[PDB]
Design a protein around this nucleic acid. Structure first.
Lengths: 75, 177, 41, 116
RNA sequence: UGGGGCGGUCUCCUCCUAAAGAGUAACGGAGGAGCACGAAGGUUGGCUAAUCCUGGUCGGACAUCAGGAGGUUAGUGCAAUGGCAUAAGCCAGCUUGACUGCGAGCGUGACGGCGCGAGCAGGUGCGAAAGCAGGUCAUAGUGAUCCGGUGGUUCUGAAUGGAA
RNA sequence: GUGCCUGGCGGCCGUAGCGCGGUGGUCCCACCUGACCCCAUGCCGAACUCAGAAGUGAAACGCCGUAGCGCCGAUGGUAGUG
RNA sequence: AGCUAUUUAGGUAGCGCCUCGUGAAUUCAUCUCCGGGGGUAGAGCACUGUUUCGGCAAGGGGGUCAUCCCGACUUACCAACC
């Protein structure tokens, strides 16, 4: 048997790279840690990446294991 | 330790000519030895381990560590997190002192033992040997013991070759064959 | 050496009828004689 | 292995500091010698590197590798920390157990005047 | 309900459906929840597998020892997806932040409502300190309003002082 | 003027990594001796730590070769597609 | 002629969509250049599933038998894992 499905959680990147954001704005709502927090970016309890300061988003790849990092350049 | 200095003198000069070791650090040094006591009957008897634990401590000079059940084998009625194994490691000064306790009076105490099954190696210079009894060790009182608990000894050295590891056993008057 | 968990030792001279009487840090009770040993087997 | 495990033991707190932007103070400890240096928050350049290998201090020491020697270098770096202009520094474990000489070195920085 | 009686379904979570933002239907396809934990929570410190390969008291492919390869194929209170060693996985010490008052700015909704959150004030705890802690790896574990109960609080209390 | 040495902290995360062979020790480093006590092992100075240090370059680690693999990789064609 | 909810399903309410009024920032749209995360088409077989035949081939059965506990040969037969 089946015939039931949950309602979508509306995830994804809320603010794409290259966007001037305000502090506290949500950048990425994910389940796991597909994207790790970088500079001026905090990671919520729900692994939701938000802005610690104002500035433009800079999606980058760092670390020895090549994982994506989101940093904000307060410019 | 009497044979620790005995090791420091005649064993190294013996090794320098047998395999032409151009370094004294290139000689295999006898490291830790473990006295394994995997009882296996600890499925319901909590008291059974305490004997072979304290007895293993009586055989050695320290209290052994209780080895918990790693996997979950339904065949032996065990799951992850069950106290069943028991082991004690002799390393350092007391490593040599216990070696004296065995190769002098305890090894010839094994019935009809004039030579050992030498081909029981690991492949990387370390020797293993299990004994079915406990009586062979001088610490056993014989009359107070209620069951034959056999222990297993591992000779972990830094030797990489088995015959080079057995060469280390040769310098300690080991009855082989 | 962690305290309280260790049994005590004693300077036990492994006595032999031939003369292989040598001291061993052991924990039995006394010094006993026997024939079959390292150099009397 | 010893060295490899130490680095994987220190990397936890070290990543927290590079996001905190704090001026760190790393400590390298070996049986024969003990090092202590200051690193600017950018991560590449170092400022003051006072260690036991500096013979200008070894001529006043007995044997590099003991507690008092750790207290000697901690004094030297903390004094030169102010001599170059480093006020507040965050101490770093660098994987070493905060008990022996490292604790002696950390005390030496605190009694000299360095802030932390 | 492809007409109805017989069986299912109705709220919530995961995957596919779903056409690389989000969303996205079927009596379409696979599964689960209606709790749990005083610690499985916080912090400090430490540690890291599975699976086999060898010689081994009983003991054998299948306990336990050591070596080796191997590499996260292990594990994560629970379903699946994502995540994880800087471990969130495992062990231990110390503890109660499973804290009160707020909340820049945000994501998600027609709305009700839900979710994330730096920083600020009081005060508490762990660590030498830097710092960290307002539940748990995250996503389910729950329901509006009315009526009424228990405790606190002069805020009101229909002449005034009280009380209901 | 710098060169070869090791060690420390990063940038950059495989053209940077394994594998094989060859070297390296005054210095640095690792290993090593001892451990009543600082501290520690749910057993053991293995690790942790202190006090020290003779010896060695074996192991580890560094470096030099080797491309047997790994990894990297256009031009062009093809698949697909607005 | 959609979304959400509804003893709701040819009804109704909120938002979307239309009109009139008023008020506002090159605000909005098209193309070019630049900055982006995506993982579908295609492609591929490390992982996750699964295919086929072939090999190993355990349980072995039964006989030349042991005509006691073993099991050798074994016609060859699926063929747990790899």
């Amino acid at each position: 048997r089946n015939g039931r499905d949950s309602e979508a959680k509306r995830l994804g990147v809320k603010r794409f790279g290259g966007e001037s954001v305000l502090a506290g704005s949500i950048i990425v709502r994910q389940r796991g840690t597909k994207f790790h927090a970088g500079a001026n970016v905090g990671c919520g309890r729900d692994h939701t990446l938000f802005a610690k300061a104002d500035g433009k988003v800079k999606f980058e790849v760092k670390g020895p294991k090549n994982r994506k990092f989101i940093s904000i350049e307060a410019e | 330790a009497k044979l620790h200095d005995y090791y420091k003198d005649e064993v190294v000069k013996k090794l320098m000519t047998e395999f032409n070791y151009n370094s004294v650090m290139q000689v295999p040094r006898v490291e830790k030895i473990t006295l394994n006591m995997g009882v296996g009957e600890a499925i319901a008897d909590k008291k059974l381990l305490d004997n072979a634990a304290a007895d293993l401590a009586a055989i050695s000079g320290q209290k052994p560590l209780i080895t918990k059940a790693r996997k979950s084998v339904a065949g032996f009625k065990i799951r992850q997190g069950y106290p069943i194994g028991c082991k004690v490691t002799l390393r350092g000064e007391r490593m040599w002192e216990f070696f004296e306790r065995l190769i002098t009076i305890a090894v010839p105490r094994i019935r009809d033992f004039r030579g050992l099954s030498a081909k029981s190696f690991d492949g990387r210079g370390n020797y293993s040997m299990g004994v079915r009894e406990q009586i062979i060790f001088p610490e056993i009182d014989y009359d107070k013991v209620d069951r034959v608990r056999g222990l297993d000894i591992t000779i972990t050295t830094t030797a990489k070759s088995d015959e080079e590891g057995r060469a280390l056993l040769a310098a300690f008057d080991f009855p082989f064959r | 050496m962690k305290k309280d968990i260790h049994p005590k030792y004693e300077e036990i001279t492994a006595s032999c009828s031939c003369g292989n009487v040598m001291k061993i840090r052991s924990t039995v009770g006394h010094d006993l004689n026997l024939d079959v040993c390292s150099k009397c087997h | 292995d010893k060295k490899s495990a130490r680095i994987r033991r220190a990397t936890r707190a070290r990543r927290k500091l590079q996001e905190l932007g704090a001026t760190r103070l790393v400590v390298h400890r070996t049986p024969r010698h003990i090092y202590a240096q200051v690193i600017a928050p950018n991560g590449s350049e170092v400022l003051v590197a006072a260690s036991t290998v500096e013979k200008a201090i070894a001529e006043q020491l007995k044997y590099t590798g003991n507690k008092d020697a750790a207290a000697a270098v901690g004094k030297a770096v903390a004094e030169r920390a102010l001599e170059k202009g480093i006020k507040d520094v965050s101490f770093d474990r660098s994987g070493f157990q905060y008990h022996g000489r490292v604790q002696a070195l950390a005390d030496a920085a605190r009694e000299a005047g360095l802030q932390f």
